[PDB]
Write a protein that binds this ligand. Structure first.
Ligand SMILES: [Mg+2]
Ligand SMILES: [Mg+2]
Ligand SMILES: [Mg+2]
Ligand SMILES: [Mg+2]
Ligand SMILES: [Mg+2]
Ligand SMILES: [Mg+2]
Ligand SMILES: [Mg+2]
Ligand SMILES: [Mg+2]
Ligand SMILES: [Mg+2]
Ligand SMILES: [Mg+2]
Ligand SMILES: [Mg+2]
Ligand SMILES: [Mg+2]
Ligand SMILES: [Mg+2]
Ligand SMILES: [Mg+2]
Ligand SMILES: [Mg+2]
Ligand SMILES: [Mg+2]
Lengths: 124, 185, 141, 55
RNA sequence: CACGGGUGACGGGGAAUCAGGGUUCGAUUCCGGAGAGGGAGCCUGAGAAACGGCUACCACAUCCAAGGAAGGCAGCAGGCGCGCAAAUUACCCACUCCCGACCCGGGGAGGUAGUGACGAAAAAUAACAAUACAGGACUCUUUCGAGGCCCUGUAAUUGGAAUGAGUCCACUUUAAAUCCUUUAACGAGGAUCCAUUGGAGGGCAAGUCUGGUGCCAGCAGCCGCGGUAAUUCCAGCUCCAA
């Protein structure tokens, strides 16, 4: 029942990708999870699903169509080289530090008081 | 300095005299003959029709054979033909001054649902539209003030997922049927 | 217009300025004498402390005691007379408490049978006076 | 004399408001107004009386 | 119309009202000026008379061992005060850009949420059928009365249908969330899942209804009401306006 189509397909080889806008027709169902259609793109474009990146899914008023954006990578090593870090983390390839932004700021201003190799000491 | 628009606009205007019997009774006909909700719906239609008249009147005083006398003349006429308030053979920009606000209330989705026969009364039509039972070219429309273009006027039918279409029964029938079998055994 | 030359714009314009000062409403808005005479200072509302509770006679054809309150403004210290509007509402106002006052309707002019008041009470002790009449709220004790 | 304040509001009788059925709102209210005034009524003799006319 | 004075005067692009002319507003996100408690003087630097740079004096104010040291929220929050009068001591550099030796670091610029009836757009609070009735065009009928092919409205009468407010699995959204959108399961009979705010003498739409008060209390923007049959006060019922 779920059928996907691609519009505005275009290959940019200076970023080693090929990106398109994805249209999903899922009549009567909730919005299809992204992990489900990365398979369908993989079958459609003859590649492994782990280099498949999709985002920006908006379901139209009425509940039968969803238009998102997708982009297909030549290799996983290229993908890690030029990709937003937050979008790799959704797939698990990246883990950002769990240091709060506020915490980093007062630690900056404490090291500023001290001079010399004791700059490293005052941190924790 | 922020990144947003702030561009807004009022769509109506209140009349100057609040308590005129002649005016009160004339806009009570429309609000009951078309099943409207308050006077502000009537007022915003008088206001849009007043923009069309105000545009034409300043165009009419313009000397004919002016490029904007023609370009904005035809554009204004083409828009009114597309929505069906001005019929095709009668389109020259002195003919839109003789135009009534009942013609614009004619082209509402609420009125059309009545005339296509999908509803029983003009009030019943407004109920179906709000309850998501009407679609226009594979697109359910949730509002009775949707204005119908002449070309899409023949594509109004029930929505695919509707008990009045080919869909599931609603809560009432599903619950009554379940209790019927639940009470029987 | 009386003078109708092409080169008489200075004559016509400078004659409007002189003759606009004989307009009474123009005269008071564009002079500082009226603004400094206003107890409010040009505001729509003002708060003050109750000094005493007073009642004035009305006027020649009428005959009734108008329940009023003598209030001293906070921003200035000026003393004005306000009119507790509704029927029996004077009970809710006691001496030495804070009230919110507003104009009485006619832009600094006396209104109706009450002689020489320009002001009215809308809130006492930070609770609306109309709400006390309706019983929706009670005096904060 | 400041002693007679609140005189009438106090000495007047106290009558509770009787319970009454709710009033239809929005489009239904204007639908009722249309029927009571334009489609149901018939012209009468001479001058017509008002909506709240009573004897 | 100099000079002097006042301005509740930062200027402009613009805003409100508007027939044609005009009148009033512009502290306020874009451009330009000025200023960092008040004045004055400088260092470095291409660029400063810089204040999240320095030096004085004036005012205010902090720590102190009483010898001294330190200060500038008209930045983001937040607090006191003033007042008629104005929000969180939140999350993030993911977007827009800027800075640096820089593809990598940083940015209370800026973004995202919270409060938010300033204001602007859309838009629920019922729909339908059956009985009883009441009218209407119809017929017969002198009318009355009756036939309903035809309606139209009304009735805390009966009846099954349709939904979203809400609860909430998930997906989607997103830097991470939230909201919207999609979608399971529950979710409407007094559908109590109960619409208010002002009025009913005139202007000005709408009761000479009933009970109370008796020039008192009160109402009334104006005209005026009230003195023992108040259409105007205080209440109940009914009606009007949005
Ligand atoms: Mg100034
Ligand atoms: Mg300015
Ligand atoms: Mg400067
Ligand atoms: Mg300061
Ligand atoms: Mg300086
Ligand atoms: Mg600072
Ligand atoms: Mg600076
Ligand atoms: Mg405010
Ligand atoms: Mg950034
Ligand atoms: Mg960075
Ligand atoms: Mg900011
Ligand atoms: Mg409600
Ligand atoms: Mg009354
Ligand atoms: Mg009136
Ligand atoms: Mg009248
Ligand atoms: Mg009146």
């Amino acid at each position: 029942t779920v059928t996907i189509r691609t519009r505005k397909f275009m290959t940019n080889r200076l970023l080693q990708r090929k990106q398109m806008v994805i249209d999903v027709l899922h009549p009567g169902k909730a919005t299809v999870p992204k992990t489900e259609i990365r398979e369908k793109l993989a079958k459609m474009y003859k590649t492994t699903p782990d280099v498949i990146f999709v985002f920006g899914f908006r379901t139209h008023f009425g509940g039968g169509k969803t238009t998102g954006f997708g982009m297909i990578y030549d290799s996983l090593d290229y993908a890690k080289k030029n990709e937003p870090k937050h979008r790799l983390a959704r797939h698990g390839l990246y883990e950002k530090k769990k240091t709060s932004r506020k915490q980093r700021k007062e630690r900056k201003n404490r090291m500023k008081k001290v001079r010399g190799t004791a700059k490293a000491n005052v941190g924790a | 300095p922020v990144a947003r628009s702030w561009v807004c606009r009022k769509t109506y205007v209140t009349p100057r005299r609040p308590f005129e019997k002649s005016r009160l009774d004339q806009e009570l006909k429309l609000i009951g003959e078309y099943g409207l909700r308050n006077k502000r719906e009537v007022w915003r239609v008088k206001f849009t029709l007043a923009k069309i008249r105000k545009a034409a009147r300043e165009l009419l005083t313009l000397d004919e054979k002016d490029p904007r006398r023609l370009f904005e003349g035809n554009a204004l006429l083409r828009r009114l033909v597309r929505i069906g308030v001005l019929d095709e053979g009668k389109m020259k920009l002195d003919y839109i001054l003789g135009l009534k606000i009942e013609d614009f209330l004619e082209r509402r989705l609420q009125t059309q649902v009545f005339k296509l026969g999908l509803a029983k009364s003009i009030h019943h039509a407004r109920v179906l539209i709000r309850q998501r039972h009407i679609r226009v070219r594979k697109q359910v429309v949730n509002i009775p003030s949707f204005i119908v273009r002449l070309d899409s006027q023949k594509h109004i039918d029930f929505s695919l997922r509707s008990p009045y279409g080919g869909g599931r029964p609603g809560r009432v029938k599903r619950k009554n049927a379940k209790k019927g079998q639940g009470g029987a055994g | 217009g009386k003078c109708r030359g092409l080169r008489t714009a200075r004559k016509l314009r400078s004659h409007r300025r002189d003759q606009k000062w004989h307009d009474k409403q123009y005269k008071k808005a564009h002079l500082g004498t009226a603004l400094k005479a206003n107890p409010f200072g040009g505001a729509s509302h003002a708060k003050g402390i109750v000094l005493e509770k007073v009642g004035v006679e009305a006027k020649q054809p009428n005959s009734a005691i108008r329940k009023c309150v003598r209030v001293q403004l906070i921003k200035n210290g000026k003393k004005i007379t306000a009119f507790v509007p509704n029927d029996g509402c004077l009970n809710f106002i006691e001496e030495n408490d804070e009230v919110l006052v507003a104009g009485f309707g006619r832009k600094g002019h006396a209104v109706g049978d009450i002689p020489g008041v320009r002001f009215k009470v809308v809130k006492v002790a930070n609770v609306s006076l109309l709400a006390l009449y309706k019983g929706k709220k009670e005096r904060p004790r | 004399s400041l002693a007679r304040v609140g005189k009438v509001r106090g000495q007047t009788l106290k009558v509770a408001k009787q319970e009454k059925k709710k009033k239809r709102t929005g489009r239904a209210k204007r639908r009722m107004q249309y029927n009571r005034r334009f489609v149901n009524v018939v012209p009468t003799f001479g001058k017509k009386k008002g909506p709240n006319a009573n004897s």
